[PDB]
Design a protein around this motif. Structure first.
Motif, PDB file in Angstrom:
ATOM      1  N   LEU A 163      49.564 -46.916  28.462  1.00 47.61           N
ATOM      2  CA  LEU A 163      48.864 -45.687  28.843  1.00 47.61           C
ATOM      3  C   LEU A 163      48.212 -45.865  30.203  1.00 47.61           C
ATOM      4  O   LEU A 163      47.616 -46.914  30.479  1.00 47.61           O
ATOM      5  CB  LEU A 163      47.801 -45.339  27.787  1.00 47.61           C
ATOM      6  CG  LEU A 163      46.856 -44.148  28.016  1.00 47.61           C
ATOM      7  CD1 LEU A 163      47.594 -42.822  27.946  1.00 47.61           C
ATOM      8  CD2 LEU A 163      45.693 -44.154  27.013  1.00 47.61           C
ATOM      9  N   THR A 164      48.311 -44.859  31.062  1.00 46.44           N
ATOM     10  CA  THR A 164      47.546 -44.888  32.304  1.00 46.44           C
ATOM     11  C   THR A 164      46.911 -43.524  32.553  1.00 46.44           C
ATOM     12  O   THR A 164      47.265 -42.535  31.913  1.00 46.44           O
ATOM     13  CB  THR A 164      48.416 -45.307  33.512  1.00 46.44           C
ATOM     14  OG1 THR A 164      47.577 -45.571  34.645  1.00 46.44           O
ATOM     15  CG2 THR A 164      49.439 -44.211  33.883  1.00 46.44           C
ATOM     16  N   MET A 165      45.942 -43.476  33.458  1.00 41.77           N
ATOM     17  CA  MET A 165      45.288 -42.211  33.782  1.00 41.77           C
ATOM     18  C   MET A 165      45.791 -41.710  35.126  1.00 41.77           C
ATOM     19  O   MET A 165      45.818 -42.464  36.098  1.00 41.77           O
ATOM     20  CB  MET A 165      43.764 -42.374  33.804  1.00 41.77           C
ATOM     21  CG  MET A 165      43.161 -42.760  32.458  1.00 41.77           C
ATOM     22  SD  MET A 165      43.272 -41.435  31.232  1.00 41.77           S
ATOM     23  CE  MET A 165      43.144 -42.349  29.695  1.00 41.77           C
ATOM     24  N   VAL A 166      46.208 -40.446  35.175  1.00 51.21           N
ATOM     25  CA  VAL A 166      46.719 -39.857  36.408  1.00 51.21           C
ATOM     26  C   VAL A 166      45.894 -38.646  36.815  1.00 51.21           C
ATOM     27  O   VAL A 166      45.792 -37.674  36.070  1.00 51.21           O
ATOM     28  CB  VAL A 166      48.199 -39.422  36.284  1.00 51.21           C
ATOM     29  CG1 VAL A 166      48.672 -38.794  37.593  1.00 51.21           C
ATOM     30  CG2 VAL A 166      49.085 -40.606  35.911  1.00 51.21           C
ATOM     31  N   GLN A 168      41.287 -36.448  34.907  1.00 50.32           N
ATOM     32  CA  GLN A 168      41.988 -37.694  34.606  1.00 50.32           C
ATOM     33  C   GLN A 168      42.856 -37.446  33.386  1.00 50.32           C
ATOM     34  O   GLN A 168      42.354 -37.249  32.282  1.00 50.32           O
ATOM     35  CB  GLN A 168      41.018 -38.854  34.352  1.00 50.32           C
ATOM     36  CG  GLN A 168      40.253 -39.344  35.585  1.00 50.32           C
ATOM     37  CD  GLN A 168      41.147 -39.978  36.643  1.00 50.32           C
ATOM     38  OE1 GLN A 168      42.268 -40.402  36.361  1.00 50.32           O
ATOM     39  NE2 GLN A 168      40.644 -40.051  37.871  1.00 50.32           N
ATOM     40  N   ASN A 169      44.166 -37.433  33.591  1.00 55.07           N
ATOM     41  CA  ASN A 169      45.083 -37.063  32.534  1.00 55.07           C
ATOM     42  C   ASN A 169      45.756 -38.292  31.943  1.00 55.07           C
ATOM     43  O   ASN A 169      46.370 -39.060  32.667  1.00 55.07           O
ATOM     44  CB  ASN A 169      46.137 -36.084  33.059  1.00 55.07           C
ATOM     45  CG  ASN A 169      45.519 -34.871  33.739  1.00 55.07           C
ATOM     46  OD1 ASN A 169      45.209 -33.884  33.079  1.00 55.07           O
ATOM     47  ND2 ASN A 169      45.342 -34.940  35.064  1.00 55.07           N
ATOM     48  N   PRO A 170      45.634 -38.483  30.619  1.00 52.25           N
ATOM     49  CA  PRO A 170      46.302 -39.605  29.947  1.00 52.25           C
ATOM     50  C   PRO A 170      47.823 -39.460  29.955  1.00 52.25           C
ATOM     51  O   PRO A 170      48.356 -38.499  29.414  1.00 52.25           O
ATOM     52  CB  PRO A 170      45.746 -39.543  28.515  1.00 52.25           C
ATOM     53  CG  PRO A 170      45.286 -38.121  28.342  1.00 52.25           C
ATOM     54  CD  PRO A 170      44.814 -37.680  29.692  1.00 52.25           C
ATOM     55  N   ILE A 171      48.503 -40.416  30.581  1.00 49.21           N
ATOM     56  CA  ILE A 171      49.957 -40.429  30.671  1.00 49.21           C
ATOM     57  C   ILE A 171      50.495 -41.712  30.039  1.00 49.21           C
ATOM     58  O   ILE A 171      50.191 -42.818  30.488  1.00 49.21           O
ATOM     59  CB  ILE A 171      50.434 -40.329  32.138  1.00 49.21           C
ATOM     60  CG1 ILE A 171      49.940 -39.030  32.798  1.00 49.21           C
ATOM     61  CG2 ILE A 171      51.955 -40.496  32.241  1.00 49.21           C
ATOM     62  CD1 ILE A 171      50.560 -37.744  32.231  1.00 49.21           C
ATOM     63  N   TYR A 172      51.293 -41.562  28.992  1.00 48.01           N
ATOM     64  CA  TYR A 172      51.948 -42.699  28.390  1.00 48.01           C
ATOM     65  C   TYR A 172      53.201 -43.061  29.176  1.00 48.01           C
ATOM     66  O   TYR A 172      54.262 -42.467  28.977  1.00 48.01           O
ATOM     67  CB  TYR A 172      52.293 -42.397  26.932  1.00 48.01           C
ATOM     68  CG  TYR A 172      51.085 -42.471  26.016  1.00 48.01           C
ATOM     69  CD1 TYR A 172      50.607 -43.698  25.572  1.00 48.01           C
ATOM     70  CD2 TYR A 172      50.435 -41.320  25.608  1.00 48.01           C
ATOM     71  CE1 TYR A 172      49.503 -43.779  24.722  1.00 48.01           C
ATOM     72  CE2 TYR A 172      49.315 -41.386  24.766  1.00 48.01           C
ATOM     73  CZ  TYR A 172      48.868 -42.618  24.327  1.00 48.01           C
ATOM     74  OH  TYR A 172      47.768 -42.685  23.497  1.00 48.01           O
TER      75      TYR A 172
END
Ligand SMILES: CC(C)CCC[C@@H](C)CCC[C@@H](C)CCC[C@@H](C)CCOC[C@@H](CO)OCC[C@H](C)CCC[C@H](C)CCC[C@H](C)CCCC(C)C
Ligand SMILES: CC(C)CCC[C@@H](C)CCC[C@@H](C)CCC[C@@H](C)CCOC[C@@H](CO)OCC[C@H](C)CCC[C@H](C)CCC[C@H](C)CCCC(C)C
Ligand SMILES: CC(C)CCC[C@@H](C)CCC[C@@H](C)CCC[C@@H](C)CCOC[C@@H](CO)OCC[C@H](C)CCC[C@H](C)CCC[C@H](C)CCCC(C)C
Ligand SMILES: CC(C)CCC[C@@H](C)CCC[C@@H](C)CCC[C@@H](C)CCOC[C@@H](CO)OCC[C@H](C)CCC[C@H](C)CCC[C@H](C)CCCC(C)C
Ligand SMILES: CC(C)CCC[C@@H](C)CCC[C@@H](C)CCC[C@@H](C)CCOC[C@@H](CO)OCC[C@H](C)CCC[C@H](C)CCC[C@H](C)CCCC(C)C
Ligand SMILES: CC(C)CCC[C@@H](C)CCC[C@@H](C)CCC[C@@H](C)CCOC[C@@H](CO)OCC[C@H](C)CCC[C@H](C)CCC[C@H](C)CCCC(C)C
Ligand SMILES: *C/C=C(C)/C=C/C=C(C)/C=C/C1=C(C)CCCC1(C)C
Ligand SMILES: *C/C=C(C)/C=C/C=C(C)/C=C/C1=C(C)CCCC1(C)C
Ligand SMILES: *C/C=C(C)/C=C/C=C(C)/C=C/C1=C(C)CCCC1(C)C
Ligand SMILES: CCCCCCCCCCCCCCC
Ligand SMILES: CCCCCCCCCCCCCCC
Ligand SMILES: CCCCCCCCCCCCCCC
Ligand SMILES: CCCCCCCCCCCCCC
Ligand SMILES: CCCCCCCCCCCCCC
Ligand SMILES: CCCCCCCCCCCCCC
Ligand SMILES: CCCCCCCCCCCCC
Ligand SMILES: CCCCCCCCCCCCC
Ligand SMILES: CCCCCCCCCCCCC
Ligand SMILES: CCCCCCCCCCC
Ligand SMILES: CCCCCCCCCCC
Ligand SMILES: CCCCCCCCCCC
Ligand SMILES: CCCCCCCCCCC
Ligand SMILES: CCCCCCCCCC
Ligand SMILES: CCCCCCCCCC
Ligand SMILES: CCCCCCCCCC
Ligand SMILES: CCCCCCCCC
Ligand SMILES: CCCCCCCCC
Ligand SMILES: CCCCCCCCC
Ligand SMILES: CCCCCCCC
Ligand SMILES: CCCCCCCC
Ligand SMILES: CCCCCCCC
Ligand SMILES: CCCCCCCC
Ligand SMILES: CCCCCCCC
Ligand SMILES: CCCCCCCC
Ligand SMILES: CCCCCCCC
Ligand SMILES: CCCCCCCC
Ligand SMILES: CCCCCCCC
Lengths: 231, 231, 231
Positions: free
Chosen positions: C63-66, C72-76
């Motif tokens: 998981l990272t934050m974009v 800040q959107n959680p992106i797997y």
């Protein structure tokens, strides 16, 4: 996007790769010969990959800042992502043309991977003097590839069909001249000694890339060498 | 560079991989047999890739800091970049020796990819207890590979030429012993429980790497098993 | 782990991929036919890779934050790492079933790589409107793949064994329906327009993934089409 003076060359590069991709795609629609299908597949994929990476550079995704020489230096890392996949595809086009043995193909692709991978490390290296150590190792891998293309392939082409021998010779010569320019542009450009500014560097790579991909593909896909000998 | 006590082993590793690469390259110059060319290509690429990654560790590029256990822990990530490419090449040398079927080769390479990939995730994982979950999954992939090398390959070698059967058996035994040491060193070293200090860990991996690559290659490339049966 | 509402679907996904992996592994133990071994190898690797990446998402590694849309959107990102390797393996299962020519296989795998790679770039792109440019390019690569599966493969299956023709037709239909849902879920989910919340998005992808991998594999590995015609 227009905030970077080199944007015009990224945009032109994107357009020319896009147009080249579409042209090869349409051209290969009328192809049933299993051998020709291989060359069309390989050769169409090359500008398609380059199109995506040129676009990523245009939109700013494929750019990072690298500290060296006490400066934040703009480095387009997307070039290496492109080249990682397109340069072995280009070599595969050549190797299949002359029916290279499997060991030779693996040696070529492997050396090519080392060439691009070490170029990437050099591009991202923060200790200035070390960037040129990676450049030297990459250039040695290039010289191996060029050696094999001349003293392993050329004399393989001559025992093959005349149309494949003549087409190979032309594409070999195009490849050696165009590919040899890349380490020079890197060395004098923003990645290396910084003598040529980034906007001119970007222009130079765009001309080389279009010539090495769309130019190369136009020569190859117009030859009868890509077809099996059939009645 | 000398600021890290483990630098001496990185430098020795770089030198030995470099020397091993040059030796195999020169040795394979006088080879025309298509089968032998495959083994020379595969086997020369292995220390060449390792040379580049040892150099990146020596110069400091292939090192990152990972927070776990309340500390900034030095993790050499370049090892996994090396191993990602060299361990399937090593398995390919073994598989081609015994003329393995394609399904078996894909199973081996795939399990190997999982082994290295999960080792990388474990090495970079910030939750300490989770590092060992990844170690366990990676070790299970290793055990699958070792199982196949014994109960899928050994009885394949016996129906082949005696020279390939005997060479395979030796290289199989070298591989199983050397490769089994890697998860132990990781577990007790700076990536795992931290009982053995990084400088000694680095020494241990250097001995294993040179033995598993240059040692392995010396045995293989001196065998007549790599040549087609010819008059 | 339980701090994220979508954890339950990541855990169920991990379990189902794990169980699917073990089932195919055991099932393929009693297989000696060289053709069947290829399909078992390919088809077992698919949920094994997915298992590792589901686990990395569950434990939080994948998981990272974009930053986009001022949030800040959680992106797997681990999904793309999975899909990079499992979607060409799935296509390879289909292509081997119908004895596709090499050029066609390279076109499929190449288009698939572009599809996943551009999806990854879109997922990580910080300029909101540009995310949908990458979505469109990826979707065009998907449409190429679906075109080939229908107007290059279906009429190849019909000249083959009836059992391979019927099995291919079923797996083709499963593939086209399931794969076409992925760009829709991305577009309406947290990566795109954000209309469907992440927890429901995660559920949707889990159902699609299990169906496209374990479901697909159950159909394929129960068919006699994977065996060579033998007495
Ligand atoms: C079958 O063998 C021949 C197929 O090769 C030809 C197959 C091609 C290699 C297919 C790969 C191209 C994909 C369709 C890529 C889709 C997006 C492209 C980048 C299109 C971009 C050009 C346009 C947007 C200007
Ligand atoms: C048969 C042929 C293919 C042989 C191939 C030849 C090949 C060995 C030549 C060398 C390749 C090697 C240099 C690739 C390195 C990729 C690396 C630059 C990616 C960026 O990461 C570098 C640093 C930031 O600068 O990351 C900061 C630290 C991060 C924590 C890094 C951790 C992630 C690692 C990058 C994981 C490594 C994965 C592999 C390198 C994937 C290969 C990518 C591709 C570029 C080769
Ligand atoms: C043809 O088949 C045999 C060729 O295999 C042998 C081909 C080799 C695999 C070629 C790959 C080696 C490349 C030439 C790599 C160039 C840089 C090397 C890392 C050299 C480093 C050693 C030196 C600097 C000490
Ligand atoms: C057939 C066989 C080959 C099967 C292969 C088995 C394989 C599936 C096993 C698992 C591989 C998978 C773990 C690879 C993960 C690479 C990853 C560690 C790279 C570093 O990124 C991790 C985090 C920082 O820790 O990035 C911070 C967040 C960043 C935003 C990350 C976004 C970039 C992603 C890394 C993109 C993924 C690309 C692929 C993983 C490339 C594979 C690299 C190589 C190491 C496998
Ligand atoms: C020989 O051809 C058939 C072998 O294919 C079948 C070979 C398989 C592809 C082997 C790959 C599986 C590896 C053994 C992976 C090891 C870890 C797995 C992810 C196991 C996870 C499931 C369990 C932990 C619930
Ligand atoms: C034949 C087929 C396989 C054809 C393949 C089609 C393919 C060309 C389609 C495009 C793939 C390309 C988009 C892969 C990009 C990976 C990239 C997202 C990894 C994450 O890095 C992105 C930024 C942070 O957002 O890094 C921050 C800046 C960092 C400094 C980045 C520097 C490291 C670079 C990532 C090195 C590039 C290595 C290659 C991209 C490895 C490919 C990985 C995989 C995802 C394709
Ligand atoms: C389509 C793109 C092509 C054909 C690119 C070719 C690129 C090279 C031959 C690059 C070579 C390099 C070196 C030899 C050392 C310096 C760094 C590089 C990567 C520019
Ligand atoms: C030339 C390098 C070689 C042969 C390296 C082999 C490495 C391994 C077999 C590593 C195995 C690991 C595990 C089984 C789990 C723990 C992590 C690893 C990656 C060290
Ligand atoms: C096992 C996993 C499978 C079969 C995943 C398939 C995924 C896709 C077909 C994804 C397609 C996408 C697009 C066409 C554009 C938007 C982004 C993607 C990557 C979701
Ligand atoms: C292989 C070609 C490398 C030579 C490139 C020549 C570029 C000349 C452009 C002028 C240099 C700009 C310097 C002043 C800004
Ligand atoms: C597979 C071999 C693993 C065993 C490694 C033994 C290393 C012994 C070195 C002494 C340990 C150092 C501890 C004190 C610093
Ligand atoms: C291809 C399927 C896409 C459609 C997905 C439908 C999901 C419906 C769930 C309700 C949406 C939740 C909105 C309120 C939170
Ligand atoms: C690091 C990426 C290397 C793979 C690039 C894709 C091209 C591979 C061509 C394979 C040639 C066939 C060798 C037998
Ligand atoms: C993730 C990198 C895996 C590829 C490593 C390169 C070695 C691949 C060898 C291919 C063996 C041939 C299988 C048919
Ligand atoms: C970017 C990763 C692409 C490779 C995925 C692994 C599957 C490759 C299958 C190769 C098919 C054989 C083509 C001749
Ligand atoms: C050594 C092989 C002979 C053919 C290759 C020509 C080498 C051209 C040098 C390119 C310049 C790179 C800096
Ligand atoms: C289970 C297959 C039998 C051959 C493999 C031997 C396993 C050695 C264990 C290695 C130790 C890893 C921790
Ligand atoms: C154009 C090829 C015909 C078969 C493919 C069907 C296309 C389905 C569209 C999927 C929806 C994606 C947004
Ligand atoms: C700051 C530049 C230092 C010179 C480095 C040149 C290294 C080139 C290596 C060629 C063998
Ligand atoms: C490391 C650069 C090598 C360039 C000269 C070629 C050496 C001979 C190789 C024969 C296959
Ligand atoms: C802090 C260490 C916690 C122990 C974790 C061990 C996990 C090993 C998994 C083996 C099944
Ligand atoms: C903020 C959304 C802006 C609309 C972008 C849509 C681009 C879709 C491209 C399809 C050709
Ligand atoms: C078919 C034309 C493709 C050109 C798209 C990219 C050009 C950039 C314009 C700003
Ligand atoms: C041919 C010898 C190659 C050794 C180069 C790297 C050794 C590191 C010396 C500091
Ligand atoms: C064999 C069952 C495998 C399930 C392991 C992962 C499930 C997550 C439980 C929290
Ligand atoms: C290196 C320049 C290539 C020129 C391509 C022209 C193609 C016309 C057939
Ligand atoms: C595992 C040790 C290998 C020893 C290599 C010696 C090679 C001499 C032929
Ligand atoms: C798309 C749903 C697949 C259903 C799998 C059932 C397998 C039973 C043979
Ligand atoms: C860019 C589309 C090309 C139009 C067809 C050219 C003749 C095959
Ligand atoms: C006889 C082939 C000559 C090709 C030279 C092209 C140089 C760009
Ligand atoms: C074979 C001639 C090579 C020419 C090199 C040109 C570099 C710009
Ligand atoms: C390191 C160079 C090796 C010299 C030749 C050895 C005999 C083939
Ligand atoms: C009969 C082969 C024995 C090889 C053992 C080597 C152990 C390092
Ligand atoms: C087959 C014997 C394996 C020995 C394992 C040694 C690990 C250090
Ligand atoms: C999950 C283990 C499966 C048990 C065997 C099923 C019949 C082959
Ligand atoms: C005749 C094959 C029908 C399969 C349809 C499955 C839809 C999920
Ligand atoms: C061939 C029918 C495709 C159905 C698409 C469904 C997308 C959710």
């Amino acid at each position: 996007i227009t905030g970077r003076p080199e944007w015009i060359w990224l945009a032109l590069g994107t357009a020319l790769m896009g147009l080249g991709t579409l042209y090869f795609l349409v051209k290969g629609m009328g192809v049933s010969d299993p051998d020709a299908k291989k060359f069309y597949a390989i050769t169409t994929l090359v500008p398609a990959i380059a199109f995506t990476m040129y676009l990523s550079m245009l939109l700013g995704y494929g750019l990072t800042m690298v500290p060296f020489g006490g400066e934040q230096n703009p480095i387009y890392w997307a070039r290496y992502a492109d080249w990682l996949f397109t340069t072995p595809l280009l070599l595969l086009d050549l190797a299949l043309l002359v029916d290279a043995d499997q060991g030779t193909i693996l040696a070529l692709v492997g050396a090519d991977g080392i060439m691009i991978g070490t170029g990437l490390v050099g591009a991202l290296t923060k200790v200035y003097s070390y960037r040129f150590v990676w450049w030297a190792i990459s250039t040695a891998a290039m010289l191996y590839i060029l050696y094999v293309l001349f003293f392993g392939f050329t004399s393989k082409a001559e025992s093959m069909r005349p149309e494949v021998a003549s087409t190979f010779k032309v594409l070999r010569n195009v490849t050696v001249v165009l590919w040899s320019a890349y380490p020079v542009v890197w060395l004098i450009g923003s990645e290396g000694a910084g003598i040529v500014p980034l906007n001119i560097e970007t222009l130079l790579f765009m001309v080389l890339d279009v010539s090495a991909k769309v130019g190369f593909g136009l020569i190859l896909l117009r030859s009868r060498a890509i077809f099996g000998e059939a009645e």
